[PDB]
Amino acid sequence: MRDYDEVTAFLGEWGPFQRLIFFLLSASIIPNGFTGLSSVFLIATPEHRCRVPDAANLSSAWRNHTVPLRLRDGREVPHSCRRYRLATIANFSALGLEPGRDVDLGQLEQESCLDGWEFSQDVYLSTIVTEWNLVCEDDWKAPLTISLFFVGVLLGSFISGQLSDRFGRKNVLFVTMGMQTGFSFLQIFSKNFEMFVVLFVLVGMGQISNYVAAFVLGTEILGKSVRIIFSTLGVCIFYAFGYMVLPLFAYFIRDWRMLLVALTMPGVLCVALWWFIPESPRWLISQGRFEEAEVIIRKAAKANGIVVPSTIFDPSELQDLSSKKQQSHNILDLLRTWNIRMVTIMSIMLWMTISVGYFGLSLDTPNLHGDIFVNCFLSAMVEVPAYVLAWLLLQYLPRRYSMATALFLGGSVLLFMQLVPPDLYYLATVLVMVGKFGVTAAFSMVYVYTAELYPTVVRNMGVGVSSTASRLGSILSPYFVYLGAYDRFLPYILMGSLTILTAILTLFLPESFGTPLPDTIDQMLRVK
Ligand code: NA
Incomplete structure (x- = not known):
């Protein structure tokens, strides 16, 4: 045969x-x-403030103070969801009372926008948010x-x-x-x-x-x-090329x-x-x-x-x-034994956390200081060297130490973000890009590591479970960036802590480098 x-x-x-x-x-x-990542530009949020109609008889004095102020990054900016009561403002605007002198702006009533928002067009012309x-x-x-x-x-x-x-x-x-x-x-x-x-x-x-x-x-x-080269460098590099081309279009088209x-x-x-x-x-x-x-x-x-x-x-x-003989399909085989159960739980956690970090770091580019288009391009560019390094490491070095170091670097670099002072704001961007590089490398290596850890009889099922966990992590990723409204650095603290914990977890997996791949669960390597 x-x-x-x-x-x-x-x-x-x-x-x-x-x-x-x-x-x-x-x-x-x-x-x-x-x-996939077109949401960075289709669903971006421009600056906005409560609208005020033109029918109100407001002088130039009041037309400059129709919205309360707030502090942001030391500076002050208009409130994005409140406005002084238009009826009250106009009542004494018509009578000739002046802002800040006769009526204290710190005591006036406040109401939400009843006439809509303005949605400044400095960067974006229109988005689904607008x-x-x-x-x-x-x-x-x-x-x-x-x-x-x-x-x-x-x-x-x-x-x-x-x-x-x-x-x-x-x-x-x-x-x-x-x-x-x-x-x-x-x-x-x-x-x-x-x-x-x-x-x-x-x-x-x-x-x-x-x-x-x-x-x-x-x-x-x-x-x-050529199968392995296609699976690891071909599609990944061309996906990265597309992601890199995405901001070039958005630079010229803003609708x-x-x-x-x-x-x-x-x-x-x-x-x-x-x-x-x-x-x-x-x-x-x-x-x-x-x-x-x-x-x-x-x-x-x-x-x-x-x-x-x-x-x-x-x-x-x-x-x-x-x-070839059929592989088992019952998912219970992954959970009926201690060693394979522990390996499966560790793989699920690892894949989910890596996916969460990778997508959260990719979706957070519009919030970094600097040009959003250049920042997006840099976020996409660093993936290519990450894939090349991942391939070289898998080709020549043990997976456990390689992934542990990649995850450690990625997670640690994100925690230092809060320490960068505004005099060197641009140092924050390089840290985010380094973290993205490390997360991409770890994400690329985890596929080969997991595929090697599982035996042939349940390899496909275990890889599928890990991939589903990665999909769930990606689903959760956009809500980590949403926390930036409540605290600027909370998403990075969370992602870095999870990445460090995952890095420590990786050191407990068995090492498959240099050892023939097993065929049955009894030949599976034992967790540390
Ligand atoms: Na396609």
């Missing part, structure tokens, strides 16, 4: 076919890059729509695998890419907040589905070695409708790949469609320029290939 990897070895690990599949599937991830006034009493609705986006991402992860197994990798890939672009485009015509949130949920469901489908297809077509129009344009180009990406021959063989798999294999061989007589490719054996 041969194996698929052994029968198709005559194609070679690298060449025009593998090069084209690799770069066409990796480039298909660029739309996933700027779509569109539907998601401020003050309704400010909690801004992080809710982001959480619902990640909820949709969560739900899409469950059904995408089953759907692609039932209907094929390419079909689901392109269908979900089409639905993601169609629903993202329809948001331009949103009529109310509810329609926008529902469409955002479906957008996230398609974004995850067309990411998982492309990942599976790429990992199934490519060879034994959420036009920004959505621009960000959805590249997704249309990805439809041109239908004639250049083949179906996974392994899946077709598993379906019994050996003729199509043979056709695709012969086309690939012709593309690579390898002469393929019967003595080097016999399609009869293609119908009688070996098949």
Whole structure:
């Protein structure tokens, strides 16, 4: 009995076919890059103050003091959710009494905005926050729509695998890419907040589905070695490239409708790949469609320029290939033994905390001091070296110390943020970027570490559980940034403390480097 990897070895690990599949599937991830974190610009909050109509007979003296003041960063700014009672202000404004002299501004009555907000346009022209006034009493609705986006991402992860197994990798890939672009485009015509949130949920469901489908297809077509490079550096780097390109558009386009129009344009180009990406021959063989798999294999061989007589490719054996034993599906197997139970709980906590930190640090860029566009670009740029370093470390160093050090650096750098004085405010940004670098590195390494820790019989189930925990952590991430209203540094304190605790936790996991991967739970390494 041969194996698929052994029968198709005559194609070679690298060449025009593998090069084209690799770069066409990796480039298909660029739309996933700027779509996920577009909330940084679509749902931004400009400066605002209580509106006052023009019908009030207020002189220039009162027109400068219609809103109470508050201190912020030492300086004073207008109150964002209160205004002096317009009836009372006008009552003696008409009579000629002057502000601050006759009537004490510290004793006047206050009321919430009855006529709306102003939403200064220094940086943004319009956002969904300005569109539907998601401020003050309704400010909690801004992080809710982001959480619902990640909820949709969560739900899409469950059904995408089953759907692609039932209907094929390419079909689901392109269908979900089409639905993601169609629903993202329809948001331009949103009529109310509810329609926008529902469409955002479906957008996230398609974004995850067309990411998982492309990942599976790429990992199934490519060879034994190029598979790991594609899985770890290809898609991640192209996602980072998309994330880096996201702020370049937002710099020129500052209207959420036009920004959505621009960000959805590249997704249309990805439809041109239908004639250049083949179906996974392994899946077709598993379906019994050996003729199509043979056709695709012969086309690939012709593309690579390898002469393929019967003595080097016999399609009869293609119908009688070996098949690996099914992995267990009962989730109880992960919790019926002490060691695997402890490992699973530690992996869940690790993945959830890393995801929470990674997304909280990415969503908090608009609040840092400096240019929001440059800060977003820097946040995206540091991911590339993080991925390269993660790959090199996994290639040459033990995972336990590598991840422990990465998490320690990331968590510790965030705690020092409160100590930076305003004279060197820019030192805060570099600390945040270093923390993002460390968190990205740890997030990249944790996948390979967890995949190595679990045995073959429950590897897929354990990785899936850890991924679901990571999705939950991502869902929770936007609410950590929301705490910035109640305290400027609380989100960083929380994320740093959790990252440090996770770093200490990593030192208790067993070390898989240099040890053969186990096949059964009894061969699983024992926790410290
Ligand atoms: Na994609």
